[PDB]
Amino acid sequence: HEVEKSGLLNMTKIAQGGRKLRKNWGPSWVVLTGNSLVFYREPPPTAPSSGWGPAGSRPESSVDLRGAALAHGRHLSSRRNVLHIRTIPGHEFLLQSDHETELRAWHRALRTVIERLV
Ligand SMILES: O=P(O)(O)O[C@H]1[C@H](O)[C@@H](O)[C@H](OP(=O)(O)O)[C@@H](OP(=O)(O)O)[C@H]1O
């Protein structure tokens, strides 16, 4: 169960179990594994390229990527580089970076992960 990609992104929840939510954008240390996206309030104390950081570091949340859906976040945010993710329990969120190459890489990595879970 380990790390395909990790990085800081801006994130907001859009819906939880299909209930719409008021956006609340903010920075998150994001960790993509082969089956999940895990969100941390902040990045590791050190060795951030390792993804998880210390084992005692607790995540705020994570989602199951099996059968998740990806889409451009244009209709849900005015932020330039925005990706919308919807997972099968009906959680929806936006990921966003000020750097399009960063967000582009996340888009491609996330897709590949969902695809390997079919
Ligand atoms: O003004 P505060 O309470 O901080 O919250 C806003 C954010 O600051 C904006 O970034 C949101 O718009 P974008 O998602 O288009 O960036 C904006 O989204 P909205 O204008 O589409 O509702 C709000 O979520």
PDB file of C-alpha atoms in Angstrom, residues 5-118:
ATOM      1  CA  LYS A   5       2.890  10.632  -5.507  1.00  0.00           C
ATOM      2  CA  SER A   6       2.989  13.162  -2.661  1.00  0.00           C
ATOM      3  CA  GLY A   7       2.923  17.003  -2.587  1.00  0.00           C
ATOM      4  CA  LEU A   8       1.280  20.051  -1.224  1.00  0.00           C
ATOM      5  CA  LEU A   9      -1.942  21.076  -3.028  1.00  0.00           C
ATOM      6  CA  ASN A  10      -4.746  23.380  -2.237  1.00  0.00           C
ATOM      7  CA  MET A  11      -7.891  21.390  -1.590  1.00  0.00           C
ATOM      8  CA  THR A  12     -11.476  21.996  -0.820  1.00  0.00           C
ATOM      9  CA  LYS A  13     -14.303  19.535  -0.095  1.00  0.00           C
ATOM     10  CA  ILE A  14     -17.337  20.054  -2.418  1.00  0.00           C
ATOM     11  CA  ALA A  15     -19.655  17.321  -1.018  1.00  0.00           C
ATOM     12  CA  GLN A  16     -19.664  14.684   1.641  1.00  0.00           C
ATOM     13  CA  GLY A  17     -21.832  11.588   1.112  1.00  0.00           C
ATOM     14  CA  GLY A  18     -23.637  13.503  -1.609  1.00  0.00           C
ATOM     15  CA  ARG A  19     -24.422  16.483   0.645  1.00  0.00           C
ATOM     16  CA  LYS A  20     -23.192  19.742  -0.830  1.00  0.00           C
ATOM     17  CA  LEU A  21     -20.697  21.697   1.237  1.00  0.00           C
ATOM     18  CA  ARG A  22     -19.484  25.250   1.344  1.00  0.00           C
ATOM     19  CA  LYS A  23     -15.986  25.451  -0.061  1.00  0.00           C
ATOM     20  CA  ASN A  24     -13.153  25.929   2.397  1.00  0.00           C
ATOM     21  CA  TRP A  25      -9.964  26.094   0.446  1.00  0.00           C
ATOM     22  CA  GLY A  26      -6.649  25.569   2.167  1.00  0.00           C
ATOM     23  CA  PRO A  27      -3.242  23.866   1.785  1.00  0.00           C
ATOM     24  CA  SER A  28      -2.944  20.054   2.339  1.00  0.00           C
ATOM     25  CA  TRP A  29      -0.096  17.636   2.177  1.00  0.00           C
ATOM     26  CA  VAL A  30      -1.472  15.027  -0.215  1.00  0.00           C
ATOM     27  CA  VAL A  31      -0.353  11.427  -0.481  1.00  0.00           C
ATOM     28  CA  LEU A  32      -1.501   9.192  -3.298  1.00  0.00           C
ATOM     29  CA  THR A  33      -1.138   5.484  -2.888  1.00  0.00           C
ATOM     30  CA  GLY A  34      -2.245   2.643  -5.166  1.00  0.00           C
ATOM     31  CA  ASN A  35      -5.745   2.850  -3.673  1.00  0.00           C
ATOM     32  CA  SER A  36      -6.264   6.027  -1.717  1.00  0.00           C
ATOM     33  CA  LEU A  37      -5.664   9.743  -1.421  1.00  0.00           C
ATOM     34  CA  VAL A  38      -4.720  10.805   2.065  1.00  0.00           C
ATOM     35  CA  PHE A  39      -4.804  14.368   3.247  1.00  0.00           C
ATOM     36  CA  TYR A  40      -2.659  15.910   5.964  1.00  0.00           C
ATOM     37  CA  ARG A  41      -3.061  19.254   7.668  1.00  0.00           C
ATOM     38  CA  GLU A  42       0.609  19.897   6.944  1.00  0.00           C
ATOM     39  CA  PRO A  43       3.648  18.412   5.295  1.00  0.00           C
ATOM     40  CA  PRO A  44       6.224  16.166   7.121  1.00  0.00           C
ATOM     41  CA  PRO A  45       8.741  17.632   9.557  1.00  0.00           C
ATOM     42  CA  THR A  46      11.443  16.491   7.108  1.00  0.00           C
ATOM     43  CA  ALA A  47      12.097  14.108   4.192  1.00  0.00           C
ATOM     44  CA  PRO A  48       8.867  15.213   2.463  1.00  0.00           C
ATOM     45  CA  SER A  49       9.727  13.208  -0.681  1.00  0.00           C
ATOM     46  CA  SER A  50       8.930  10.063   1.391  1.00  0.00           C
ATOM     47  CA  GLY A  51       5.200  10.800   1.292  1.00  0.00           C
ATOM     48  CA  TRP A  52       3.917   9.599   4.664  1.00  0.00           C
ATOM     49  CA  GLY A  53       6.415  11.288   6.970  1.00  0.00           C
ATOM     50  CA  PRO A  54       6.730   9.809  10.482  1.00  0.00           C
ATOM     51  CA  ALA A  55       4.373   6.934  11.160  1.00  0.00           C
ATOM     52  CA  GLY A  56       2.807   8.784  14.121  1.00  0.00           C
ATOM     53  CA  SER A  57       1.757  11.676  11.859  1.00  0.00           C
ATOM     54  CA  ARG A  58      -2.030  11.564  11.583  1.00  0.00           C
ATOM     55  CA  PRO A  59      -4.045  12.376   8.408  1.00  0.00           C
ATOM     56  CA  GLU A  60      -7.192  14.480   8.501  1.00  0.00           C
ATOM     57  CA  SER A  61      -8.897  12.281   5.954  1.00  0.00           C
ATOM     58  CA  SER A  62      -8.565   9.963   2.995  1.00  0.00           C
ATOM     59  CA  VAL A  63     -10.717   8.656   0.157  1.00  0.00           C
ATOM     60  CA  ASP A  64     -11.020   5.376  -1.715  1.00  0.00           C
ATOM     61  CA  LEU A  65      -9.999   5.813  -5.354  1.00  0.00           C
ATOM     62  CA  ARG A  66     -11.716   2.657  -6.711  1.00  0.00           C
ATOM     63  CA  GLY A  67     -14.133   3.841  -9.306  1.00  0.00           C
ATOM     64  CA  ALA A  68     -13.513   7.477  -8.549  1.00  0.00           C
ATOM     65  CA  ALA A  69     -14.222  10.087 -11.276  1.00  0.00           C
ATOM     66  CA  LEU A  70     -11.931  12.812 -12.508  1.00  0.00           C
ATOM     67  CA  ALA A  71     -12.898  16.085 -14.231  1.00  0.00           C
ATOM     68  CA  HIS A  72     -11.757  19.615 -14.795  1.00  0.00           C
ATOM     69  CA  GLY A  73     -12.941  21.802 -11.966  1.00  0.00           C
ATOM     70  CA  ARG A  74     -14.056  24.744 -14.099  1.00  0.00           C
ATOM     71  CA  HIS A  75     -17.691  24.705 -13.135  1.00  0.00           C
ATOM     72  CA  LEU A  76     -16.938  24.545  -9.440  1.00  0.00           C
ATOM     73  CA  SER A  77     -14.059  27.061  -8.993  1.00  0.00           C
ATOM     74  CA  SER A  78     -12.599  30.098 -10.798  1.00  0.00           C
ATOM     75  CA  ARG A  79      -9.043  28.984  -9.801  1.00  0.00           C
ATOM     76  CA  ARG A  80      -6.929  28.378 -12.861  1.00  0.00           C
ATOM     77  CA  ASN A  81      -5.725  24.815 -12.310  1.00  0.00           C
ATOM     78  CA  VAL A  82      -8.458  22.873 -10.628  1.00  0.00           C
ATOM     79  CA  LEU A  83      -9.262  19.155 -10.726  1.00  0.00           C
ATOM     80  CA  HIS A  84     -12.520  17.744  -9.448  1.00  0.00           C
ATOM     81  CA  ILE A  85     -12.653  14.248  -7.873  1.00  0.00           C
ATOM     82  CA  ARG A  86     -15.742  12.318  -6.943  1.00  0.00           C
ATOM     83  CA  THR A  87     -15.509   9.000  -5.140  1.00  0.00           C
ATOM     84  CA  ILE A  88     -18.237   6.380  -5.002  1.00  0.00           C
ATOM     85  CA  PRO A  89     -19.527   7.283  -1.481  1.00  0.00           C
ATOM     86  CA  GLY A  90     -20.318  10.683  -2.971  1.00  0.00           C
ATOM     87  CA  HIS A  91     -17.443  12.624  -1.495  1.00  0.00           C
ATOM     88  CA  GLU A  92     -16.358  15.315  -3.926  1.00  0.00           C
ATOM     89  CA  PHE A  93     -13.430  17.673  -3.709  1.00  0.00           C
ATOM     90  CA  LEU A  94     -11.314  20.028  -5.639  1.00  0.00           C
ATOM     91  CA  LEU A  95      -7.459  19.953  -5.896  1.00  0.00           C
ATOM     92  CA  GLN A  96      -5.686  23.031  -7.163  1.00  0.00           C
ATOM     93  CA  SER A  97      -2.163  24.330  -7.650  1.00  0.00           C
ATOM     94  CA  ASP A  98      -0.855  27.664  -8.704  1.00  0.00           C
ATOM     95  CA  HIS A  99       1.583  25.711 -10.851  1.00  0.00           C
ATOM     96  CA  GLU A 100      -0.086  23.982 -13.771  1.00  0.00           C
ATOM     97  CA  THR A 101       2.655  21.421 -14.267  1.00  0.00           C
ATOM     98  CA  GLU A 102       2.201  20.268 -10.699  1.00  0.00           C
ATOM     99  CA  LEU A 103      -1.490  19.927 -10.983  1.00  0.00           C
ATOM    100  CA  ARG A 104      -1.180  18.343 -14.421  1.00  0.00           C
ATOM    101  CA  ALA A 105       1.103  15.675 -12.936  1.00  0.00           C
ATOM    102  CA  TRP A 106      -1.433  14.972 -10.220  1.00  0.00           C
ATOM    103  CA  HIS A 107      -4.205  14.685 -12.774  1.00  0.00           C
ATOM    104  CA  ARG A 108      -2.244  12.076 -14.747  1.00  0.00           C
ATOM    105  CA  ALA A 109      -1.104  10.148 -11.698  1.00  0.00           C
ATOM    106  CA  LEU A 110      -4.613  10.002 -10.230  1.00  0.00           C
ATOM    107  CA  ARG A 111      -6.106   8.755 -13.415  1.00  0.00           C
ATOM    108  CA  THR A 112      -3.506   5.957 -13.718  1.00  0.00           C
ATOM    109  CA  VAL A 113      -4.284   4.913 -10.111  1.00  0.00           C
ATOM    110  CA  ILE A 114      -8.072   4.790 -10.715  1.00  0.00           C
ATOM    111  CA  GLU A 115      -7.466   2.898 -13.900  1.00  0.00           C
ATOM    112  CA  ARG A 116      -5.287   0.257 -12.201  1.00  0.00           C
ATOM    113  CA  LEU A 117      -8.174  -0.366  -9.759  1.00  0.00           C
ATOM    114  CA  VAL A 118     -10.746  -1.273 -12.394  1.00  0.00           C
TER     115      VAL A 118
END
